[PDB]
Amino acid sequence: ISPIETVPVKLKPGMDGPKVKQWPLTEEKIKALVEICTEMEKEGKISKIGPENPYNTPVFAIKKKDSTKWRKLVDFRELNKRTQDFWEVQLGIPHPAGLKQKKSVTVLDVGDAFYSVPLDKDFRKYTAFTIPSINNETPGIRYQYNVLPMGWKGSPAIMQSSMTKILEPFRKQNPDIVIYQYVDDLYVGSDLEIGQHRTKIEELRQHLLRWGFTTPDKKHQKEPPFLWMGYELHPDKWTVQPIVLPEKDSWTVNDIQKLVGKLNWASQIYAGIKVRQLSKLLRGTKALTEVVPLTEEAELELAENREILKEPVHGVYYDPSKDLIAEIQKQGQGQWTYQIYQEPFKNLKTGKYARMKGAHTNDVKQLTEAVQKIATESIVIWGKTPKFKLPIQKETWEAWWTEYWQATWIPEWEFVNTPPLVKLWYQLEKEPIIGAETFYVDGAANRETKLGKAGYVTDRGRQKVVPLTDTTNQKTELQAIHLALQDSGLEVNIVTDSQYALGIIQAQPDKSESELVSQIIEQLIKKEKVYLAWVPAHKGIGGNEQVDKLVS
Amino acid sequence: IETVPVKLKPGMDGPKVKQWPLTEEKIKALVEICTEMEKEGKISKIGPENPYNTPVFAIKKKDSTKWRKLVDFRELNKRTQDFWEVQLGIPHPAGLKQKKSVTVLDVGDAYFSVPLDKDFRKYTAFTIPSINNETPGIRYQYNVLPQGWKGSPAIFQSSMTKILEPFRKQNPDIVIYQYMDDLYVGSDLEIGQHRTKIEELRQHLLRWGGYELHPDKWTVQPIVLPEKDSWTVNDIQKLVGKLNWASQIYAGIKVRQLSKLLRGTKALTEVVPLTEEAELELAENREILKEPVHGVYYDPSKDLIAEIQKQGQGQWTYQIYQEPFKNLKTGKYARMKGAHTNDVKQLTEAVQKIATESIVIWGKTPKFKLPIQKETWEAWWTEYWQATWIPEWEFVNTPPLVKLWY
DNA sequence: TGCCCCCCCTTCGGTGCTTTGCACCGAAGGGGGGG
Ligand SMILES: OC[C@H]1O[C@@](CO)(O[C@H]2O[C@H](CO)[C@@H](O)[C@H](O)[C@H]2O)[C@@H](O)[C@@H]1O
């Protein structure tokens, strides 16, 4: 137990402590919980209480490991709901690509970090639990915590912030010693030669012990490779601890969920990982035990991933005297993969971006989002933004930010010829086309009936009306544009009265969750020239009036 | 000194907003700034048992290379009790918008000499991040009137008027308006002379304990019709739909004469000759468009709204209103950076200029409707912010159905 | 039969529009990883 001052905590206003009865348990668990708590009582982590304390939270018994030694955990779900909110100070996860090369490295853990931090004295009575007796022979043995319980909502933050306050004197005294503190795990690097470095280490251990934090020897790593945060720290490079993917004859939804999660974890260092086709399997499913047959595309993607994973890979460490460089490749179906490096073929890390934001988008927008994801990740890890290498031409980007009405930007980037390139798949003419037919399109739906029509008239005297079933207003308007593109030549002028349809199409999308919009896109890509114009409806205007006419 | 008792508005809790990532140079500056205010007792280290948080970052103004800490108290200010209800409030003076020049002074540090209600401090918590999450976040809360908090100009009102009094009755026709942590001070003297009344005002405040605007050049952009010798069906269609939109704003705008020249199913490129009755409609509409709209008056009890459109070639149109289509001001902001290659920087600068004009004119900033994706804005805007205040904003995706303002 | 954090992918439900469905966005469901 630390002599650090306790952090005052409160229940939420209006609420009392938990009063949850003890779910009965085996005479065996009963006696192991007796064993566990007599040793905690002699260490002062808990103390006996009686019936005058009215609170309770169930104590259940768990096998600690393969050895069969019993482990006690307390189900503070109910007390957690009644305890005040906290502001968590763990803002993120350190990444080994953010580390600089060091001469001397040490990895230490503190032992029973939680059970070494005292708990606010006035709050302890709410952590009361009861060990029951077989068949109610006795009332049972009640205890309460004097230290941070595992399973209480506030324990991780109070242990973390207590550790920060204890490390702070030592950190200020030695600014040339890097201490990464994650919960009870400490990485300590320096450029002092191992003799002076190990002096400072046991000095640090002694500081911790005066404040009640042991550092057991079995957790004191003195030699590379170091096991840290799921990685392996060698002097020149780093490593993920081995990734084992599920292998199944028959896959459940849950199996697939576990597979995608492993592949996303692997994607931080293994370039080119894809999960679009495997995650498609999760869609529309309705039970975690539902067996899902792999599609053909999913088997191929899994095999592609497995080939990548059998090759060994490593990341390098960060050299602050060189630029950060981020290179992106396009993978298809809205998937992007990236590497971040400082010297060529020496990746600090990798990643993937594959989210579809919006019902309708294009590759240029998604490239801009990938840049934004990488820019944020780079500030988290290295505190700065990388120079970019992108498979898009300057002419392409310039054509995009001059004809798109939203402000958009991407920082310093070099073009790199890495097919497939990102490109605009069509561009609407900014002026009407001489010699091209003019289509006046309209579509209307009856909100109550689900029925509608889409149609057009032209300056060449052509006209057409299609009946539509189970449709909407906005669909008939898209439908009307679909007809005009379908029946027109390579150059066309189209006048619509739907601001909605104009809005989607003028954004030059190249993919959509709408099949109707996807159909319009494939026709736009096949035209030579398209001018698309809006007019207000029901003002008896030009051709728009007669096509509206024709709709009814 | 004894504090002023402060409340949140009924049924509202303190801010609970996550800290966003920060560059190396901004974190270093915040740690330098805050450990020094720790030492001066202006803030105090706290822990996670305080459940409130407000983001913080830093800014370098382009001609002061010191860093300035900026806490984003927008959430806290919205939940804070009105001081106007409690009688403490800063009357906006008209006739600041008519001064030759107006300079902006950052005066937020005057607040650091007044303590804050012991029971309100917990709502002012913020957290400094760390690069690569080497440490957990470091949390502080204020013991004094915080910068950027709307309550600090109000609690400090009594005092600043006493600080300013000799200067203002020794200078009756200067006008001084306090907005948040800023002092907007304008008058008609020559810039060389105007500026040293600034620097004299500077020392007077320093011894008890900026940008250079010109309101007269803030011209309005009215909606304009094109002029040509000849007109196509497409030209007339565009014109008709643009005056039809303008009919929700102005009064007695007609499109029936120009409408029926497009009678029939015509080609877009066919040139339609103007009837003289249609030149009649267009000359008439053209100058209803000329002069401002009758019947539009500012209301102090309702919010200000600002809309912005990217027009291209560095240009940006904007409209400030309170009810839809009743514009108090329409304008056009222009780049001058000389770079010409960064849309996000231009929009961030446009927002600061438009909000500055609203402070000068009406005394408060508008809630902006920004023509940009949320995530593109949040990727970059703090790189270009220079104001000690931050306006409300929201993100819109409205394609141009008209090029109404161009 | 417990806690806290970051990530991705899917699903759901609230909001506002001068809408009647649509697009957006944040929260919560699963998974990965850390302690
Ligand atoms: O950009 C919006 C984004 O910013 C946050 C703070 O991180 O909210 C701020 O901006 C809003 C718009 O003005 C305010 O309403 C809010 O009070 C302010 O904190 C996020 O909450 C929001 O997602």
Residue numbers in the entry:
A (entry chain A): 2 to 553
B (entry chain B): 5 to 213, 231 to 427
Quote the study on this structure.
Fortunately, the RT/RH domains of HBV Pol exhibit weak sequence homology with human immunodeficiency virus type-1 (HIV-1) RT. In particular, a consensus sequence present across multiple regions (i.e., Motifs A, B, C and D) that creates a dNTP-binding site (N-site) for HBV/HIV-1 RT is significantly conserved. We therefore newly generated HBV RT-mimicking HIV-1 RT mutants by substituting unconserved N-site residues with corresponding amino acids in the HBV RT sequence. Here, we report the acquisition of 3TC/ETV resistance using HIV-1 with three HBV-associated amino acid substitutions (F115Y/Y116F/Q151M) in the RT N-site.
Importantly, we found that additional mutations F160M/M184V in RT rendered HIV3MB virtually fully resistant to both 3TC and ETV. To experimentally explore the structural effects of the Met184 substitution with Val/Ile, we also determined the HIV-1 RT3MB/F160M/M184V:DNA:3TC-TP ternary complex structure at a resolution of 2.57 Å. We found that two RT molecules in the asymmetric unit were in different conformations: one in a closed conformation identical to other RT3MB ternary complexes, whereas the other molecule was in an open conformation reported previously for the RTQ151M:DNA binary complex structure. Despite the difference in RT conformations, a well-defined electron density observed at both RT N-sites enabled us to build the atomic model for the cytosine base and oxathiolane moiety of 3TC-TP. However, electron density for the triphosphate and Mg2+ was quite ambiguous and we were unable to construct the model, indicating loose binding of 3TC-TP to RT3MB/F160M/M184V. The structure revealed that oxathiolane deviates from that in the RT3MB ternary complex by a maximum deviation of ~1 Å. The sulfur atom is located at the gap between Asp185 side-chain carboxyl and the 3′-end nucleotide ribose of the primer, with a distance between the sulfur atom of 3TC-TP and Cγ1 of Val184 in chains A and C of 4.37 Å (chain A) and 4.06 Å (chain C), respectively. The structural superimposition of RT3MB/F160M/M184V and RT3MB also showed that both the methylene C44 of ETV-TP and the sulfur of 3TC-TP are located 2.8–3.0 Å from Cγ1 of Val184, indicating a severe steric clash. Interestingly, the Cγ1 and Cγ2 of Val184 coincides with Cγ of Met184 in normal and backward conformations, respectively, indicating that the χ1 angle of the residue 184 side-chain is significantly restricted. The structure of HIV-1 RT3MB/F160M/M184V:DNA in complex with 3TC-TP also showed that bound 3TC-TP deviated from the tight binding position observed in RT3MB with disordered triphosphate moiety, indicating a steric clash evasion with Val184 Cγ1.
